[model samples]
Target: GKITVFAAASLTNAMQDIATQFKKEKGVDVVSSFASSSTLARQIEAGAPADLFISADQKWMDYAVDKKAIDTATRQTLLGNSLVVVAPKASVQKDFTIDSKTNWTSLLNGGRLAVGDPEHVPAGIYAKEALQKLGAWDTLSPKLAPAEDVRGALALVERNEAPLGIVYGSDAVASKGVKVVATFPEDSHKKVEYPVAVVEGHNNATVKAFYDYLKGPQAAEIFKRYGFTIK
Candidate 1:
């Protein structure tokens, strides 16, 4: 009567709302787990009870599929997002453009720049690319406050642990303690998209129905309200 869903940290709020709507319509509760796509992919690969998985990037989804953790036939890009710079709500910083002239380290104010770990987290990977495109990568590379996930990075900015952070635009919208300082131009990095699929060997009528619902109007509206672009 229920199913488990593993999803990206950035999709936390949207997924929760969608789950709520799903329950009201179907009378079946959704068991949800959120984490970095890399972490979730590995978890699924390790045989976790994930009936469905939604990843922040295609790479992690591909990783899961390559490991036979996903049912490839069920996979598709479901959403899109944008990257943004955020500072604590109380910070004196004003919105600035992401360019070589922005003086990134100075904006750090002797603190670190928070972001998801670039090695695996999709937001961080995009942030790294945007920084490189802005021509400020080398100087700030040594001062990164890398977190396990985008939400972790946003928390650093929220708590003022790091003077600034980079996360998904949706994440900045979801959090109240951080204000977006700037948005990375789309051309600065690769496309930011979310891919979703049914987990390997977990298919059933209920799961299939719910999966289709996620692509239907109700879930689409919820995702739009949460700042996601339906793909």
Candidate 2:
């Protein structure tokens, strides 16, 4: 038996490790599909057999619940995250001052700032909000290299295709080619919370077992190790 989960792209590193451990202990396969929160939620809404859904932000989870694609009673906010600016490890210039007085355009130096597509990805949504809050949205918006998801954005910076990028802090932790230069203030955007729930019609014994194991101490430690704040 297996439990299939649809999770946000940023959760890829940690969730995969959690699944491996769960599979070893429960003798059940844990299959995880990672994408932007919007994409994952839409997949579930499209009738994909996702036993569990974990969104990077509340917006997508709320969308799934509104569409009746998830079990509302099983829904809970599970994790928190933060946004950050990253530069390729090879950059001679290091670090950025991200306050309101910052000159974002000059900092870009004619290069695109890679980010997830703000139209869908939760990380992009938060990145946009943080940029907007810092009053840099308009000047920087046109210079963005929008990727399909947060990891894609990170990859662009990792490959030096984009000199700078914005992604979740945990992503910076997981990656080696990129280094965090600046962080969005806690108040810059809405709290980055991860909400998780069982998908509708998937509340069976095997699914429930995985679900409980996911929130158990073992998985929680993995999440913490990846820099996710348990909420």
Candidate 3:
């Protein structure tokens, strides 16, 4: 048997590990697709073949639910994350202190700041909120190199295409080419939460098995190891 999952791009590494473990224990092949939650949610709404769905934020999950794309009763908050500022590993600056009073314009030093599309992607939305709360948005908005997903944003920094990037804490942990410079205060943005559910009409014994495995203690440990807050 096989199970397919549609998940947010930021969950790439962690989910792959978990899926591998699941396949080992359950003898079922696992396939995962990752992208911005908004894009994935829209795909599900249009009847994409996803057995399960995990969104980076409630907004996109709510969008799926409203479209009757997921089984509501199976829905639950899966994990939590924090926003962080990162720079390429080769950067001369090792650390940065950010606050409402900080001059964000000078932080870039002529390069653009990479971030997921703040208008839609969850990571970008949180980044936007934090920047707005820190009084940095007005100065930094025009200098942003908006990406299709959080991983794309991280890649911009990893490749030194952008000197600075905003991404989830977990994403920073997974990448070796980027170093976290500072973490956004939790109070600066809405709580970063990931919500998951079985796709409506696609649930089956195999899907439910993987879904249950994801919420089990074994998966929780993996998530924690990957820097996700097990909720």
- Identify the candidate with maximal lDDT: 3
Q: Write the per-residue lDDT of candidate 2 for residues 17-55, one digit (tens) a residue.
A: 998898788888998999999999998898898999999
In model 3, the clashing pairs are none
Report lDDT per candidate: 0.91, 0.91, 0.92
- Model 3 stretches astray by more than 4 angstroms: none
Minimum summed lDDT over a 10-residue window in model 2 is located at 88-97
Error of 1 at 20 (Å): 1.1
Q: How far off is residue 137 in model 3, in Å?
A: 1.1
Which portions of model 1 miss their true places by more than 4 Å? none
- Model 2 accuracy (lDDT, Cα): 0.91
Which of candidates 1 and 3 reaches a greater lDDT? 3
Q: How much lDDT does candidate 1 score?
A: 0.91
Candidate 1 clashes between residue pairs 3 or more apart in a chain or in different chains:
none
Model 2 steric clash pairs? none
* Cα lDDT for residue 120, candidate 2: 91
lDDT-based ranking: 3, 1, 2
